[PDB]
Amino acid sequence: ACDYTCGSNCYSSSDVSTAQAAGYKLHEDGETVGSNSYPHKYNNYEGFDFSVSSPYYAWPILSSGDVYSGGSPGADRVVFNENNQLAGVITHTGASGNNFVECT
Ligand SMILES: Nc1nc2c(ncn2[C@@H]2O[C@H](CO)[C@@H](OP(=O)(O)O)[C@H]2O)c(=O)[nH]1
Ligand SMILES: [Ca+2]
Numbered sequence: 186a187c188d189y190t191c192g193s194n195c196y197s198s199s200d201v202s203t204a205q206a207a208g209y210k211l212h213e214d215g216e217t218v219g220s221n222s223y224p225h226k227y228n229n230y231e232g233f234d235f236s237v238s239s240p241y242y243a244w245p246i247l248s249s250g251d252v253y254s255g256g257s258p259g260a261d262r263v264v265f266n267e268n269n270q271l272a273g274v275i276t277h278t279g280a281s282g283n284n285f286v287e288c289t
Pocket of ligand 1 (some may be wrong): 221224225227228229230231243258262283284285
């Protein structure tokens with residue numbers, strides 16, 4: 186079973202932890218990757234009810250299992266905070282325009 190389902194993509198907690206660790210590492214070191222410069226500060230305009238405090242950052246999580254290293258980021262993102270706490274997993278899939286909806 187999927188711990189997180191983003192549209193048609195299935196993610197286990199381990200996939201999320203791996204992606205989060207990569208994203209947080211870059212944030213701590215002060216570096217970015219990709220033309221869109223990830224990780225991105227995430228403002229949470231959607232108003233998701235995260236149980237952890239902001240600031241938030243979004244980092245791509247890939248359905249292929251690989252860690253994002255540039256190129257097409259897909260539609261899914263892991264959101265973590267300044268303290269390296271998981272806020273949630275979100276996706277553009279099933280959302281209008283460039284908005285996000287939470288993965289189930
Ligand atoms: N929808 C949305 N996008 C945000 C927010 N904060 C920052 N962004 C960033 O703005 C960009 C365009 O919507 C997104 O890039 P991304 O789609 O590559 O993740 C996203 O990371 C927010 O709260 N909501
Ligand atoms: Ca997997």
